[PDB]
Amino acid sequence: LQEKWDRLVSRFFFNFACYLVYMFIFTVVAYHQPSLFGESMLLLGHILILLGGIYLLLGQLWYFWRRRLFIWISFMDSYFEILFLLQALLTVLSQVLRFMETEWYLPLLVLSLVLGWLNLLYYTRGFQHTGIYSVMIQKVILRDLLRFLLVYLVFLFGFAVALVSLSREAR
Amino acid sequence: LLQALLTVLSQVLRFMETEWYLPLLVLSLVLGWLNLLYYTRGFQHTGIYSVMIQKVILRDLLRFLLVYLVFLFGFAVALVSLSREAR
Ligand SMILES: CCCCCCCCCC(=O)OC[C@H](COP(=O)([O-])OCCN)OC(=O)CCCCCCCCC
């Protein structure tokens, strides 16, 4: 597997560079959105976003068709692909809401940008130090964070209702 | 070396009477005060202390800074693009 990785690391970093360029183009267009030569350039950028989103969606759908049982077998090894699916369809969906000229095309684009920048952590498995780092971020800390969030949300809701009900009476 | 040439360079910018001689002097002062930690190797307790400040914590801090800068830039662009529309 070390020999196979040493032979395929050039394609790994090529995919990394393509994804980084796609997110740079997606960031530039989202930064220059109009109020809801420059217009033609923005339309070309939106076309490039739609093409990249369709490409990512088709690739992820092919992966899910080939590896349908892998999600049920191991969620902690097939979750980035899920994320690589999700924002991808969001990348499509917002553009659909751009075609209909509605209000909610911009929040979907913003969530697509955020989830795309969180999806850049996949390629950190290409290096050994960041690869060991990325193991802890979803394996051990996650269950503790979910139980802590559950207890904190219970306490927060109870105390919030308490201070709401107690502060209504004036002096 | 670095602040030392800065210590020269700012004075050169003092000879030419330009604007940027003061920021270079300030960075020279800051880097000079951070260079005082070398002589802490002259004592055993501070000498053991100075090992951890560049050996183990440094790589973790660089990878943390990389991930934090990625997240910070992405979220900053998100809140910039989302807050332009008024109520
Ligand atoms: C006009 C039609 C052209 C079709 C061919 C385009 C060239 C192929 C692009 C490509 O290499 O896609 C791979 C890249 C990473 O996905 P992943 O397999 O690592 O998935 C891993 C998931 N875990 O995925 C992406 O980066 C998607 C970006 C789409 C635009 C590419 C722009 C290239 C600029 C040079």
In chain B, the residue whose alpha carbon lies closest to the alpha carbon of A24 is B74
From the list A109, A113, A129, which residue is nearest B74 (CB)? A113
Indicate if ligand 1 lies below 6 Å from the C-beta of A122.
yes
d(CA A119, CA A130): 14
Interface residues of chain A, partner chain B, Cβ below 8 Å: 27, 30-31, 33, 35-36, 106-107, 109-110, 113-114, 116-118, 120-121, 124, 129-130, 133
DSSP state of A35: P
Task: Decide if A85 contacts A64 (C-beta within 8 A).
Answer: yes
Contact A106 B81 (CB under 8 A): yes
Q: Which two tokens stand for residue A171?
A: 């002096």
Q: Give the residue among A94, A93, A68, A92 at the shortest CA–CA distance from A82.
A: A68
Residue A90, burial from CB neighbour count under 10 angstroms (0-12, 13-18, 19+)? buried
d(CA A100, CA B24): 55
d(CA A22, CA A15): 10
In chain B, the residue whose alpha carbon lies closest to the alpha carbon of A104 is B82
Sign (positive or negative) of CA dihedral A96, A102, A106, A111: negative
Tell me the three state secondary structure of residue A127: coil
In chain B, the residue whose alpha carbon lies closest to the alpha carbon of A108 is B82
Question: Could you tell me how far CA B42 lies from the centroid of its own chain?
Answer: 25
Contact B67 A113 (CB under 8 A): no
Contacts of B62 in chain A (CB under 8 A): none
Task: Decide if B77 contacts A30 (C-beta within 8 A).
Answer: yes
**Cβ partners under 8 Å of residue A104, min gap 6:** A97
Q: Return the half-sphere exposure (C-beta side, CA atoms, 13 A cut-off) of residue A11.
A: 5
What are the backbone angles phi and psi of residue A93, rounded to the nearest 5°? -65, -45
d(CA B59, CA B57): 6
Residue A42, burial from CB neighbour count under 10 angstroms (0-12, 13-18, 19+)? middle
d(CA A51, CA A57): 10
Task: Decide if B27 contacts B49 (C-beta within 8 A).
Answer: no
Q: How was this entry determined?
A: cryo-EM
d(CA A71, CA B14): 66
- State the resolution, in angstroms: 3.0
Indicate if ligand 1 lies below 6 Å from the C-beta of A16.
no
DSSP alpha helix (H) spans, chain A: 2-31, 38-66, 68-73, 80-99, 105-118, 128-136, 141-166
Q: How far is the CA of A1 from the centre of ligand 1 (A)?
A: 24
Cβ atoms within 10 Å, residue B53: 11
d(CA A138, CA B52): 28
H or E segment to which residue B68 belongs = helix B57-82
Give me the amino acid identity at A18: C
